[PDB]
Amino acid sequence: AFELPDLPYKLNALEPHISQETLEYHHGKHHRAYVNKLNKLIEGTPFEKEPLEEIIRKSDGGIFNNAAQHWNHTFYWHCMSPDGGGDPSGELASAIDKTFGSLEKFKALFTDSANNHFGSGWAWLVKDNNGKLEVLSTVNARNPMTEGKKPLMTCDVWEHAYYIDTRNDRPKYVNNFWQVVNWDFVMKNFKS
């Protein structure tokens, strides 16, 4: 029932910050696999016709892992852009200043979250039910929406996300992520 979404940009659009080869493997093999495995697992189960978000909220095991990874990568592609980088603007910028003190403090907090996460996972900027901004990392496929928190931005820190381009140097990859970060998408997410 689920499909691999097209990338929001060309395979070479994030160069030289994220390579074409990485996008070929990361989207064309890793994400594609999650979609295919998800579809097979949920066939003939209560999750067969459920929305993706509802599968994530109610499932466990392989169904959860593939469903959550599918959502997580779909979200991740929109968090980057050839037009990305620079600073946020408007109320997102204002809210970041209020919550974290400044943009550089927030960036440092997200960078540390991403760099210090042990093993596979995701670094997140989220909004809680009270509208308060928060930085946190999750293990493997886990997604903050299972704790009632809305994702605004994510950075994949599974080793496949960067090993082709930076090998073991995850911090260099996170710096590369900042050069392509799509603030327009983050702000769109912030404003609902």
Add this chain to the structure above:
Amino acid sequence: AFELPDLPYKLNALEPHISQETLEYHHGKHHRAYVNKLNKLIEGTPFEKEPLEEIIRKSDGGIFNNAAQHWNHTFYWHCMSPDGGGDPSGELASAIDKTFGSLEKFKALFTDSANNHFGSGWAWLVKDNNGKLEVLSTVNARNPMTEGKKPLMTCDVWEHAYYIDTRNDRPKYVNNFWQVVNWDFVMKNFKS
């Protein structure tokens, strides 16, 4: 006070099954970093002068993660050899046949454990202190000795173990592992 152990063979000794480049990054950077971070964390703490096994059994958080990974990687290098591959012999072979039915069923079981483990981790052949052989995988840095089980063989399934050589294709890497598996080490562990 811990030290990066020397690799038991030359950097090209596992070619073409595991590349020189992989061993340069995996041992020379990944393993080296675990040893260094371990030493910094344990200094000034009750774990400073403890044996590595005791640090693993009594610590948590970053100390555990770095202590366990240091142990795991050291163990992992001896589980491979340029003279490796082929079949086990003697008591080990007999014990494998008794417990799992045959060598190929054991290989299938270990292969599936290694291939199916979601995220970063380790596939293991262990012996419980009843003496029974068991195949299982652990998440991230976790080591079966905390459950009183003695490791006999391990295969690192963190993406850095193979991404340079097989990219997303972990199954191909596990086949490459079987060509260099060091049964002499596994049997030594089995018998002691």
